[PDB]
Write a protein that binds this ligand. Sequence first.
Ligand SMILES: *[C@@H]1O[C@H](CO)[C@@H](O)[C@H](O)[C@H]1NC(C)=O
Lengths: 50, 50
Amino acid sequence: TELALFSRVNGKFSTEFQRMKTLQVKDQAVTTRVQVRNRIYTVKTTPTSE
Amino acid sequence: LSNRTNSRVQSFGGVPFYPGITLETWQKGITNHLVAIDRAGLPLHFFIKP
Ligand SMILES: *[C@@H]1O[C@H](CO)[C@@H](O)[C@H](O)[C@H]1NC(C)=O
């Protein structure tokens, strides 16, 4: 704002506002599953066992 | 972001499988670990013969 009256009385009025805002959200979800199954032999009793 | 990996290995015969194995190593490892991949037979009464 500027105001000059009678070419003698001067006035100035300068205002400024600034608002900055920042947001960040970061999600990670890692899920690992390992499953090993070895079956080597099948052992059975002989039918003639005692 | 979304990653989804599924690995499934199924082995019959040969060295116990592990993920980092090469088919070369596996193929050279069946030298003693051989299993029955197919079989044919006869009914039981067919062998009860005079
Ligand atoms: C997993 O996600 C990455 C990014 O983090 C991507 O480059 C890749 O292609 C995806 N798949 C595998 C098997 O890594």
